[PDB]
Amino acid sequence: AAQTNAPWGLARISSTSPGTSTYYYDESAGQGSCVYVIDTGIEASHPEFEGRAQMVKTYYYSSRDGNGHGTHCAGTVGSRTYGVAKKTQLFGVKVLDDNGSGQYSTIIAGMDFVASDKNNRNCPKGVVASLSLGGGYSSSVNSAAARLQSSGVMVAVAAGNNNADARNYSPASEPSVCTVGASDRYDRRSSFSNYGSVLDIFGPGTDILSTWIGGSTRSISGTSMATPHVAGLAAYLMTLGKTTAASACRYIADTANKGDLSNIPFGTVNLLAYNNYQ
């Protein structure tokens, strides 16, 4: 399958070179896999989700995404026009308020909820969690992300938008999840993207077009935008039987586009998410 005039992020993860415009992917498109979007929630009614999105948990007064961030990230995972895995199931876990911020205790509760809720879903191809969040280092947030990962969920987390080393940020610094940095369209590291040895992979994170609240779209930047690309890629590859939840992060790093990024500090992986389609 080919999506013409795709968002540059989609086209980038199906190409060994920048500048292309078509997203090439396998027809399965993540069918049979689930992606928990742990964020501000998902406007599940957005026409771009085609009924493949629903809220399963909220930690606030409403399950409605009053921010747009979680809907944007869910869209990059598996919306029809802006998603990597266009047939995946999307589950919204609202751990962030409508101002985009959430206490650490709530983020931990949301990750433990996903680790349990997956046992009563139908995801025969596997479960992915996309965590477009992050704050200062916390051993308990790292432990929650590690618990979710070891429970059989591929966990992708943002590296953070501080232009610093991701070792000082959670859940970015948890070694056993998949920490995602942000690159731009010209294959540079995004100016804001965190780096460091804990990073596993880079994804398109600058000027990412995806869904938004009110049935609209908008482009935003951040490692929070690169994470759903990788989460969608992991759900996409798990549907093709190429990898499991426990191994998806390494597989995506094994099959990445190596050495293609610029402004990668020494000690940080120079790997760009790539689906190796045909």
CB 205 within 8 A of CB 183: yes
Q: Show which residues are catalytic.
A: 39, 69, 224
Q: Which stretch binds Ca ion (CB under 5 A): 2-10, 24-32, 194-202, 228-236?
A: 194-202
- CA 17 from centre of chain: 21
In the complex, least distance from residue 200 CB atom to Ca ion, rounded to whole angstroms: 4
| Residue nearest Ca ion, Cβ-based | 200
Q: Which stretch binds Ca ion (CB under 5 A): 2-10, 145-153, 161-169, 200-208?
A: 200-208
Residue closer to Ca ion, measured from CB, 165 or 200: 200
Length of the chain: 278
In the complex, least distance from residue 198 CB atom to Ca ion, rounded to whole angstroms: 7
In the complex, least distance from residue 199 CB atom to Ca ion, rounded to whole angstroms: 8
Structure tokens at 120: 């009563």
Instruction: Name which of 18, 20, 88, 84 is nearest 50 in CA terms.
Output: 88
Residue closer to Ca ion, measured from CB, 138 or 211: 138
Q: Is 165 part of any known ligand binding site?
A: no
The helix/strand count (H/E) of the chain reads as: 6, 15
Residue closer to Ca ion, measured from CB, 15 or 243: 243
Residue closer to Ca ion, measured from CB, 98 or 174: 174
- CA 67 from centre of chain: 17
CB 41 within 8 A of CB 55: yes
What amino acid is encoded at 159 in this protein? A
Residue 39's alpha-carbon distances to 94, 110, 189, 211, 270, in angstroms, are 5, 9, 24, 14, 27
Q: Is 175 part of any known ligand binding site?
A: yes
Q: What is the 3-state secondary structure (H, E, C) of 113-173?
A: HHHHHHHHCCCCCEEEEEECCCEECCHHHHHHHHHHHHCCEEEEEECCCCCCEHHHEECCC
Q: Which stretch binds Ca ion (CB under 5 A): 36-44, 104-112, 135-143, 198-206?
A: 198-206
Q: How far apart are CA 164 and CA 218, in angstroms?
A: 27
Q: Which stretch binds Ca ion (CB under 5 A): 124-132, 146-154, 193-201, 210-218?
A: 193-201
Q: Per CB under 5 A, does 174 bind Ca ion?
A: no
In the complex, least distance from residue 155 CB atom to Ca ion, rounded to whole angstroms: 9
Q: Is 97 part of any known ligand binding site?
A: no
Q: Per CB under 5 A, does 200 bind Ca ion?
A: yes
Number of residues that bind Ca ion (CB under 5 A): 1
Residue closer to Ca ion, measured from CB, 187 or 200: 200
Task: Give the annotated binding-site residues.
Answer: 16, 175, 177, 200, 260
Task: Give the annotated binding-site residues for Ca(2+).
Answer: 16, 175, 177, 200, 260
* Residues in touch with Ca ion (CB under 5 A): 200
